[PDB]
Amino acid sequence: MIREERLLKVLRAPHVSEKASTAMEKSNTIVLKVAKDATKAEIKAAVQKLFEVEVEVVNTLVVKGKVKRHGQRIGRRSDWKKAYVTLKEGQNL
Amino acid sequence: AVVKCKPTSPGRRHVVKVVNPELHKGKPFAPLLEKNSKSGGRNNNGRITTRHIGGGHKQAYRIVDFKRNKDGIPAVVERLEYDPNRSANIALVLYKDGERRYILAPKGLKAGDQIQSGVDAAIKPGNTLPMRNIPVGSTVHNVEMKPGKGGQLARSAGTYVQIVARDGAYVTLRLRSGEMRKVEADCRATLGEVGNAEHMLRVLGKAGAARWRGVRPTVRGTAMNPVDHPHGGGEGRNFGKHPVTPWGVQTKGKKTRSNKRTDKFIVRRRS
Amino acid sequence: MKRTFQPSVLKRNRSHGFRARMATKNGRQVLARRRAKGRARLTVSK
RNA sequence: GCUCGCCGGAAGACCAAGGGUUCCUGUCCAACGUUAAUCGGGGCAGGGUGAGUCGACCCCUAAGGCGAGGCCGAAAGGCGUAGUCGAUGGGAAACAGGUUAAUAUUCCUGUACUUGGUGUUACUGCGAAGGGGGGACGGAGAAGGCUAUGUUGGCCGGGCGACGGUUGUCCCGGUUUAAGCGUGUAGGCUGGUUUUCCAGGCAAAUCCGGAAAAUCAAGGCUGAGGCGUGAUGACGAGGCACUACGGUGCUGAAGCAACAAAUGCCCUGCUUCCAGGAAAAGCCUCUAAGCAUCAGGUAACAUCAAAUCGUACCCCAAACCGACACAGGUGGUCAGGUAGAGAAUACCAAGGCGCUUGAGAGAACUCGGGUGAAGGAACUAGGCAAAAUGGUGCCGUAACUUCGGGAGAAGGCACGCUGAUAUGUAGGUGAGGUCCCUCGCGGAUGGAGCUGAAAUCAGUCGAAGAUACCAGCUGGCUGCAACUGUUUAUUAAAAACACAGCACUGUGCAAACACGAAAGUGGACGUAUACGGUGUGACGCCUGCCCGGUGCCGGGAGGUUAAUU
RNA sequence: AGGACCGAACCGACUAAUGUUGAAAAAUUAGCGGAUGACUUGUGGCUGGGGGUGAAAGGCCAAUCAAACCGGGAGAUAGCU
């Protein structure tokens, strides 16, 4: 499922928002931006090795980037992948 | 039996239908079924090549044994069936070795009757054998034109052929068209007439009845415009043409047979 | 009333898509003329 | 915020297609919004779409597409075999509750299920691209059993009324609970088991098919719903606490029965008819090549896995197709109360709205309506338009007729409410009890309770009882076309086209004919009771004379006559 | 049983008024015909321009079809304005 070079490139950033904070307080679930091509398996092992915590389940979605017009021309933001990584009951960080 | 319908509605008054209680009710023998793809009269270019074909009921194809070359093994007729693909009826026959086939149902044949094919089968209705061993004068149907190729002559409901002569390797047949034709005597034929002679006594009674059979309307040429048909348009009802096909060829009277390679088998043309 | 454009992405792509142009010599010429004109959109794609 | 009004088989809710952030929150108002705009589907920023079992992908094919070689064609290319693609169809599995400003059968809580891998253990013949089964199939109709759902009663909580009465035969509200698991019911289909033999199933078969004995009468298969369990729970009016007054927390009564009842389910059924009603895989079974103490098969427990993409929002529309925030167009699903035959119609519930210029005024004239003295088609090309008729039951109904029709012909009578028959009837449903039982979701008996049209008699209110909405005008003579259909999308729906029926004529199958320089294909997996072309146009009585002209069919002697020599 | 009868949905389009710089480049309102059939409709497919398709009106083939649309021959030609 893993090879360390790949594992280091899969997790991109913490995602901060009220939904992401509540998901931590209420469900011990951390919300992340991950590599667009990442799989739930890679995310689960990357989190388990790097952040050194035990993972229960990983859920993922793909966010469509918003379009912004500019007179006669449009710009488009990038799609990215969101990961809801649920930690095991014994919460850490 | 042919039955008239009562005029409880105007499209019923003239219906006269062929109802045969000998025919199996319900479903056929599935292992002899194939798919049957309707065409709308269009060829592999997607063009209408034969007009007036379209719609009408879906149909499954019954695999019918026109060759009748399971020689030596007797068979019994299990039942007569309705076949949507043809005017004749068919018989489901069971061979002594467990095999089942369909055959054209000859007149008089019914469940229980025994059939058989081969050089030595008995001279009786529903039997098949090479015409060099059917007595001159007999009445046959499902006649082969080449040995072992499969029956092609006199299959439609009520038709039959008469062997009027045998000489050399060739028999002479009076086809149902009236034509006298030579066919080689090793060709197979089945004794009797094709069943369901009352087929020609049906009266569809209404337009929808022809639609159920996949026949679309015919539009008369003289009802068109000149650009569409040589029978032109006019101004009120006008004609004054010599009647032709939509493609300018003389209908009514012009011979269109042109086959020098088979001329030699035609003893006398139909009259 | 009912108008002439009734959309269907599946039918759009089959009649006019990139692969449909590529399938015939003349469709491949539609794409040549279009690349020589310098178009941004060769066909309507995803 | 309190009222009023509108839709309610939609103007509500949910899908697909299509769109693509329009979704939620904050903030802003120039432009966009047919007005103002603090508001917005507008600007700016941030947030938001969570799946083994919902869809896609995936396996399987349909029409059809593509197509190694190949056949054909000046080139380009056309067609096509093996194959390979292609859903609008077939194929494993998840439900109820809670939660967010915005997602949820995806998160959480509870309770499940499916198919694979790995291990353990007991038993065991395993094995396919092949065989067989199965999957797997129409229309119409009948009506029995049910559920969804509703109504009443009971039960529980609350109520005692702004103005005469209201502790009662009173008022209001609630009375909800899934998949899964167990049971195998109303009902549907079918005889079962053993042995032996065999020209079929491309070889093989223990399977299918066929044959022959033996033997038992009950065996198997399918199957809504109910009941139980799931549920020690969830949901639940309300209560008590807090509250930034938006909310949050804790707690929580009854949760039954009877009757009615679908167009949903049993039903891919049953009955019946002719027009005779996909394919392939998954699946079950059979063997072949093989493998034989291996492998593999079946089972229980355990363990692991089920990736990836979609998921926001609009969706009969202000977000899709219409240049517009356009009276247009857009496939499927859901179906509450009263009246009603009803999915018509009227009023309502849930839910959603008052349609993005308003304020006054109360002229002509225009638009859309209501009423009208006397007359009643005198109008006009024409009763154009209006007005009128309109329901159910019973009585009754002409010429003509192809005996079906004409016919709802025409015309007439009854119609509300209350009581009696009967404090609720005929009927429908059906409990306790008693008895039997191959004991059950059983049978008989029994008739309580519940529900309930219609009739007659008597009485009674109004001008009027099919009172509203809703809802045929009728008759006589005649042209034309038999009829139902079809047609000039957008000035013509007709007497025009079609039609069943009739005739002529071609066509012996490598058919005629048609699309194609061709290959190939349609005709047709049809075969003269068939297929094409042409005309006529149900049916009834019938269809006469003319072959000179033009056309077509047949003819061979003579004349004339091409390339060629 | 029925191209059977009455009648919503659904399909159609006989009459009239309105509208005609429309709410709408064909509609709206009141009426109207079919409504188990030659019915109606979703998804996808096939047929291509002297060609298709046509229950036939020269109808339809992407808002003007007795020969579509686009590009090219092209500055066709115009004894005409």
Swiss-Prot record, chain A:
GO CC annotation terms, alphabetical: cytoplasm; cytosolic large ribosomal subunit
Assigned keywords, A-Z: Ribonucleoprotein, Ribosomal protein, RNA-binding, rRNA-binding
InterPro entries, A to Z: Nucleotide-bd_a/b_plait_sf, Ribosomal_uL23-like, Ribosomal_uL23/eL15/eS24_sf, Ribosomal_uL23_CS
GO biological process, one term: ribosomal large subunit assembly
Pfam families with a match to the protein in the record: Ribosomal_L23
Subunit structure: Part of the 50S ribosomal subunit. Contacts protein L29 and trigger factor. Might also contact SecE and probably does contact SecG and SecY when the SecYEG translocation complex is docked with the ribosome.
Family assignment from sequence similarity: Belongs to the universal ribosomal protein uL23 family.
PANTHER family linked: 60S RIBOSOMAL PROTEIN L23A (PTHR11620)
Role summary: One of the early assembly proteins, it binds 23S rRNA; is essential for growth. One of the proteins that surround the polypeptide exit tunnel on the outside of the subunit. Acts as the docking site for trigger factor for Ffh binding to the ribosome (SRP54) and to nascent polypeptide chains.
Protein's recorded name: Large ribosomal subunit protein uL23
Gene: rplW
From Swiss-Prot, chain B:
Positions of the UniProt region annotated as Disordered: 27-52, 220-271
Segments of skewed composition (Low complexity): 38-47
Keywords annotated in UniProt: Acetylation, Ribonucleoprotein, Ribosomal protein, RNA-binding, rRNA-binding
GO molecular function: RNA binding; rRNA binding; structural constituent of ribosome; transferase activity; zinc ion binding
PROSITE patterns: RIBOSOMAL_L2
One Gene Ontology term, aspect cellular component: cytoplasm
Keyword Nucleotide-binding: no
Residues bearing PTM N6-acetyllysine: K241
Tagged with keyword Ligase: no
Alphabetical list of InterPro entries matching this protein: NA-bd_OB-fold, Rib_uL2_dom2, Ribosomal_uL2, Ribosomal_uL2_bac/org-type, Ribosomal_uL2_C, Ribosomal_uL2_CS, Ribosomal_uL2_dom3, Ribosomal_uL2_RNA-bd_dom
One Gene Ontology term from the biological process aspect of the record: ribosomal large subunit assembly
Residue ranges the record marks as coiled coil: none
Subunit details: Part of the 50S ribosomal subunit. Forms a bridge to the 30S subunit in the 70S ribosome, contacting the 16S rRNA. Interacts weakly with S6 in one of the 3.5 A resolved structures. In pull-down experiments interacts with CedA.
Family according to the record: Belongs to the universal ribosomal protein uL2 family.
Free-text function comment from the UniProt entry: One of the primary rRNA binding proteins. Located near the base of the L1 stalk, it is probably also mobile. Required for association of the 30S and 50S subunits to form the 70S ribosome, for tRNA binding and peptide bond formation. It has been suggested to have peptidyltransferase activity; this is highly controversial.
HAMAP family documented for this protein: Ribosomal_uL2_B
Family matches, as NCBIfam families: rplB_bact
Miscellaneous remark of the record: This protein can be partially replaced in vivo by its H.marismortui (HmaL2) or human (L8, from the 60S cytoplasmic ribosome) homolog.
Name of this chain's protein: Large ribosomal subunit protein uL2
Source organism per UniProt: Escherichia coli (strain K12)
Taxonomic path: Bacteria, Pseudomonadati, Pseudomonadota, Gammaproteobacteria, Enterobacterales
Record gene name: rplB
UniProtKB/Swiss-Prot annotation, chain C:
Name under which the protein is recorded: Large ribosomal subunit protein bL34
One Pfam family it belongs to: Ribosomal_L34
MF terms (GO), sorted A to Z: structural constituent of ribosome
Keywords: Ribonucleoprotein, Ribosomal protein
Domain of life of the organism encoding this protein: Bacteria
Similarity field: Belongs to the bacterial ribosomal protein bL34 family.
Subunit structure: Part of the 50S ribosomal subunit.
Lineage, uppermost ranks: Bacteria, Pseudomonadati, Pseudomonadota, Gammaproteobacteria, Enterobacterales
GO terms under cellular component: cytoplasm; cytosolic large ribosomal subunit
GO biological process: cytoplasmic translation
